[PDB]
Structures are given as C-alpha cells and as structure tokens.
Design an enzyme around this catalytic site. Sequence first.
Site, PDB file in Angstrom:
ATOM      1  N   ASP A  36      22.144  46.861 -40.130  1.00 25.38           N
ATOM      2  CA  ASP A  36      21.912  47.416 -40.810  1.00 25.38           C
ATOM      3  C   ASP A  36      20.592  47.549 -41.687  1.00 25.38           C
ATOM      4  O   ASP A  36      20.329  46.851 -41.020  1.00 25.38           O
ATOM      5  CB  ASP A  36      23.577  47.750 -41.944  1.00 25.38           C
ATOM      6  N   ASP A  51      19.934  47.685 -45.241  1.00 22.11           N
ATOM      7  CA  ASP A  51      19.735  46.505 -46.326  1.00 22.11           C
ATOM      8  C   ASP A  51      20.332  45.282 -45.254  1.00 22.11           C
ATOM      9  O   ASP A  51      20.287  44.889 -47.091  1.00 22.11           O
ATOM     10  CB  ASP A  51      20.798  47.467 -46.668  1.00 22.11           C
ATOM     11  N   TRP A  85      32.208  56.623 -43.818  1.00 23.06           N
ATOM     12  CA  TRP A  85      32.374  55.188 -43.840  1.00 23.06           C
ATOM     13  C   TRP A  85      33.277  54.353 -43.331  1.00 23.06           C
ATOM     14  O   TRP A  85      34.890  55.227 -43.136  1.00 23.06           O
ATOM     15  CB  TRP A  85      32.640  54.502 -45.495  1.00 23.06           C
ATOM     16  N   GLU A 137      34.189  52.277 -37.974  1.00 25.39           N
ATOM     17  CA  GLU A 137      33.675  51.881 -36.714  1.00 25.39           C
ATOM     18  C   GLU A 137      33.300  50.767 -35.864  1.00 25.39           C
ATOM     19  O   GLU A 137      32.974  50.222 -34.611  1.00 25.39           O
ATOM     20  CB  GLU A 137      32.214  53.005 -36.085  1.00 25.39           C
ATOM     21  N   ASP A 138      33.596  49.981 -36.806  1.00 28.90           N
ATOM     22  CA  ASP A 138      33.061  48.729 -36.716  1.00 28.90           C
ATOM     23  C   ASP A 138      34.163  48.187 -35.830  1.00 28.90           C
ATOM     24  O   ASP A 138      33.785  47.033 -34.881  1.00 28.90           O
ATOM     25  CB  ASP A 138      31.767  47.412 -37.076  1.00 28.90           C
ATOM     26  N   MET A 144      21.871  41.318 -48.887  1.00 28.81           N
ATOM     27  CA  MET A 144      22.215  42.996 -48.679  1.00 28.81           C
ATOM     28  C   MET A 144      21.192  43.552 -50.279  1.00 28.81           C
ATOM     29  O   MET A 144      21.541  42.531 -51.220  1.00 28.81           O
ATOM     30  CB  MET A 144      23.556  43.137 -49.034  1.00 28.81           C
ATOM     31  N   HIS A 171      22.796  48.628 -53.915  1.00 30.72           N
ATOM     32  CA  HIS A 171      22.484  50.508 -53.463  1.00 30.72           C
ATOM     33  C   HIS A 171      23.944  50.901 -54.848  1.00 30.72           C
ATOM     34  O   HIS A 171      24.932  50.692 -54.210  1.00 30.72           O
ATOM     35  CB  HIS A 171      22.110  50.589 -52.184  1.00 30.72           C
ATOM     36  N   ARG A 210      26.274  53.929 -54.252  1.00 28.24           N
ATOM     37  CA  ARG A 210      27.041  54.750 -52.976  1.00 28.24           C
ATOM     38  C   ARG A 210      25.917  55.914 -52.726  1.00 28.24           C
ATOM     39  O   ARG A 210      25.995  56.892 -53.784  1.00 28.24           O
ATOM     40  CB  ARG A 210      28.857  55.729 -54.005  1.00 28.24           C
TER      41      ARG A 210
HETATM   42  C1  NAG Z   1      38.608  50.656 -41.004  1.00 32.31           C
HETATM   43  C2  NAG Z   1      37.896  50.439 -42.668  1.00 32.31           C
HETATM   44  O1  NAG Z   1      37.959  50.467 -43.094  1.00 32.31           O
HETATM   45  N1  NAG Z   1      37.566  48.619 -42.373  1.00 32.31           N
HETATM   46  C3  NAG Z   1      36.268  48.404 -42.730  1.00 32.31           C
HETATM   47  C4  NAG Z   1      35.174  47.444 -42.099  1.00 32.31           C
HETATM   48  O2  NAG Z   1      34.673  49.750 -41.475  1.00 32.31           O
HETATM   49  C5  NAG Z   1      34.017  47.665 -42.890  1.00 32.31           C
HETATM   50  O3  NAG Z   1      32.942  46.988 -42.054  1.00 32.31           O
HETATM   51  C6  NAG Z   1      34.686  46.141 -43.524  1.00 32.31           C
HETATM   52  C7  NAG Z   1      33.550  45.865 -44.599  1.00 32.31           C
HETATM   53  O4  NAG Z   1      32.782  46.417 -45.588  1.00 32.31           O
HETATM   54  O5  NAG Z   1      35.527  45.967 -43.901  1.00 32.31           O
HETATM   55  C8  NAG Z   1      36.758  47.324 -43.333  1.00 32.31           C
HETATM   56  O6  NAG Z   1      37.775  47.450 -44.323  1.00 32.31           O
END
Ligand code: NAG
Lengths: 123, 272
Positions: free
Chosen positions: B122, B124, B184, B187-188, B214, B217, B219
Amino acid sequence: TELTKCKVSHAIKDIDGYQGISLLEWACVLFHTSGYDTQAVVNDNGSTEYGLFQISDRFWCKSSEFPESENICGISCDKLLDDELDDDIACAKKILAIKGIDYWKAYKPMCSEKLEQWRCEKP
Amino acid sequence: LTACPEESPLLVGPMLIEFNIPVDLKLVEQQNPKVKLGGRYTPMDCISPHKVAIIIPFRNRQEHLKYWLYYLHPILQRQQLDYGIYVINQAGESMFNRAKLLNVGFKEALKDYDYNCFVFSDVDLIPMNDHNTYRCFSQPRHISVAMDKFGFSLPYVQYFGGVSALSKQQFLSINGFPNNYWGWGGEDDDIYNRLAFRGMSVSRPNAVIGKTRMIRHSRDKKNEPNPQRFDRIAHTKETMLSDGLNSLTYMVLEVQRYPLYTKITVDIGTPS
Ligand SMILES: CC(=O)N[C@@H]1[C@@H](O)[C@H](O)[C@@H](CO)O[C@H]1O
Ligand SMILES: [Ca+2]
C-alpha cells in the site's frame, strides 16, 4: 473511539455465552465488523449500519434518514456512536434472540476457527 | 563482482518515520543518484539474487507517494536489492480495486525485466526497521506485521494485507490475485485463502523488526466497504480457478517513466 480487543472484551461481558456465542467469537466478529471503532458508519444498499456492532437502521434503530424504520431496538442510531456500550449490547442481544449470529456476516468466514488468538488475558 | 552477502552490511535497524517535513522529489532524486529512470536500481558492489518488482496500487495519493519514495529508496538500496518501483494508477470513478491493480503490476513489471520476486505495498505504509527485507522467501511473506494502526501488532493471524511479497512461482501457483473485489475489504483475506489452498504457510518477521507506520488520511468515498466481501471470501477455493491472472483484462492509458518510479495509468473496467 478505536478500542482495543481487551477494552471491547471487558465491556461486552454480559453478552458472553448469549445464544451460545463466546467472548472469543465476539472479539473476532467485532474486529472484522467495525475494527473496534465505536463511531463506525457504513452504508449498505439504501441503509446505514452504526457503531461497534454495526447495527442497521433498516430494522433495528431509528435514524433521521429513515424515520419509519421498525426501530426494533427502540433507540436512536446516534446512541450507537458513543463509548457507552450498554445499549449497543442490549440491541445486539435483541438481534441475537430475534435474527441470530448470522446478522453479522463476518462470523462464519472469519470466526469459525483460530479463536484462541482472540482471548484477552488482561484482567 | 560476487553474490551480495546474506544479510546486508549497510543496515541501520530501527528508524524514525515522520510525515512532518514536506517532501521534494527533486531532493529525493538528489539524495538517490543511483536510482535510474523508471525507479530502477541494481547494486554495483555485488550481485543480488533478489530481482524485485515493488507494486503499489494507487489513486490520487501523490502526497503519500512522495513520503513512500523518500523513505523506501534509501532502505531498498541498503537492502541490496535489484529492484523497480511501479505505481499502478486506477483511472475512472469506480470503487478502488486493490487486488486487480496488483495483478496489473505483476504483468506489466514483467515486460521490463525478468523479476523473480514481487512486493505488493500500500502507498501509505513505511517500514520502521530496515532488517524487514522487501524481498521474497521460501514461503509467502507478510511484511507489514506490526502496523501502528493496529497498535504495532498483527490484528489477526490470517491477516495478509498491507505489504506482502510473493516469489513469481508462489504468485503463479495461486493464479495470482482476484479481480472481482471492488471497494474496500476482503481481497487480502481471499489472497490468504489462496495461499492456504495451495498448501503454503505465511512467513513473517517478528513484531519488532516488522514495525510499520501508516500515513494518516480521511475516508476515501471511492473505496467504501465492499458489501459482498464476506460472501466472496467464503468461495475462494472455487473462484480462484476462474478469477485471477488467467482472467485479467485491462487497458493501459499511459506508461510514465519518472526518475524515481514508473507510473502506469490503467482502465480496469467496472464491477462485473
Ligand atoms: C473481510 C474484511 O473486511 N477483511 C478486512 C481486511 O480486508 C483488512 O485488510 C483488515 C485490516 O483493516 O481487516 C479485515 O476485517
Ligand atoms: Ca452506546
């Protein structure tokens, strides 16, 4: 306020075991639901979800955007954006009793395993 | 010249990371004369076995990029990596698609050099300790393990967001990343699921050397919580077969080679 897992766990004790959901499972659910941010506000298809538990104005609380909501919890959604968690918890219990844990979409995919990491050992 | 040592003799360890003093790329370039057009750098003192493409998903965060470049170039050179910086800029007004932009970076970077490692970062996040090497390991590497945002700790053991690194083989093995996550979140986690399904485990540095800052910033209305994220991550085992490198399509609107980096503006379509 962005709370810590332990702050949250300590505040939601009365919910421990309600409808069979433990404190570990809740710590996990709340992190993925609001990131422990008591002031979280998210839109979701014509409706808004509020606070730590992301309680929706669609059926549960009354908002100015949607005043004729069933307001099942009998509460203004703004009461879910502060750091006094008693009413957030009371409303969550109504959701649990009426709808069940699956109201929280994070539960099944993120909180079905590896629950120990969610334990707060801090008294 | 011979192989670079296993651990770089140039490391300094913990560093102070502040976003107070405004940055000036002209100065950054001045301080980093070894970085070549497009943000490429190769050690002259030894041969690095780490040919690293660093991919940054991006949309309207130039101030963040400045800080990222100001801090990372000196760090990456100290780490003795043969690297290139790629900023994948999402054109349009659709919700931000982090994973898809990372996939584009993988494909585009490969057009420049035979990279064997990909760091996805990312724009940031800045590492606070240069022992936290921006390269690939025998297993998928999660790098931003102790972000200040989560109190300098890993929020959950399955977390693979922020900054991560996959060798080319590791990335290929999971059919790359999903293209279908718009907005948002999740995906990770989907990527995490993919690695697990392919039998891999996550390698991480400890919480001290993994300290990461980080840049703050407000929203991004262009990146609101994805309403479908929770459903999507429950089907990764099946969807990773039909959504990934093998189904990636996009249009390149512009490739810009600047002295500190390569910026590729792309049109990645809209939610299907
Ligand atoms: C399914 C979902 O929303 N997963 C999020 C993920 O994408 C994010 O990287 C992490 C930290 O903010 O928090 C999780 O809850
Ligand atoms: Ca309250």
